[PDB]
Ligand binder design. Structure first.
Ligand code: A1A7P
Ligand code: BR
Length: 167
């Protein structure tokens, strides 16, 4: 038993809610919140901008030190950093950004990072301003992640479309 509330059960291990991941994190304080990162950990907009804003830019400061030490992530890769006031840890995961022309096949690799954590609060990778088909992203999630994932989808119309079209 865990403390996530109001989620719809899609599969054995995947749950979904129409909610802002920031507000879900502030409520649950999960062990892991997933950020929809880019390879430079530049958290300007989308989910990343929203999470970073809710940390008062502490996420960005920490990320800048990470990049200065380690260099950029790979598309499809991840790193674990602090969750600041939102969660114990933040798993920064880089899905492919179709609006940058990146290879959507890397989306499966991106979701594989979730399997290193028993439970996660996550956004829909590569959707939104990353330009991929959100129905496809949800399909890849369900077919790749084996650990327990609570998906927060902020856009109400999208949430409704995702539930109604789920196979
Ligand atoms: O709705 C969707 C589908 C894909 C990404 N996305 N956005 C979010 N998803 C979960 N929580 C928060 C946001 C969010 N909220 C405010 C500003 C920006 C944001 F990205
Ligand atoms: Br977005």
């Amino acid at each position: 038993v865990n403390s996530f509330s109001g989620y719809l059960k899609l599969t054995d291990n995947v749950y979904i809610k129409n909610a802002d991941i920031v507000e879900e994190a502030k409520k649950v304080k999960p062990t892991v919140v997933v950020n929809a990162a880019n390879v430079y950990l530049k958290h300007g907009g989308g989910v990343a901008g929203a999470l970073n804003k809710a940390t008062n830019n502490a996420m960005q400061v920490e990320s800048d030190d990470y990049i200065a030490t380690n260099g950029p992530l790979k598309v499809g890769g991840s790193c674990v950093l602090s969750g600041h006031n939102l969660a114990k840890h933040c798993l920064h995961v880089v899905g492919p950004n179709v609006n940058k022309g990146e290879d959507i096949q890397l989306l499966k690799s991106a979701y594989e990072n979730f399997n290193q954590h028993e439970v996660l609060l996550a956004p829909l990778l590569s959707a939104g301003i990353f330009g991929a088909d959100p129905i496809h992203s949800l399909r890849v999630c369900v077919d790749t992640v084996r650990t327990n994932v609570y998906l927060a989808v902020f856009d109400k119309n999208l949430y409704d479309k995702l539930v109604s079209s789920f196979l």
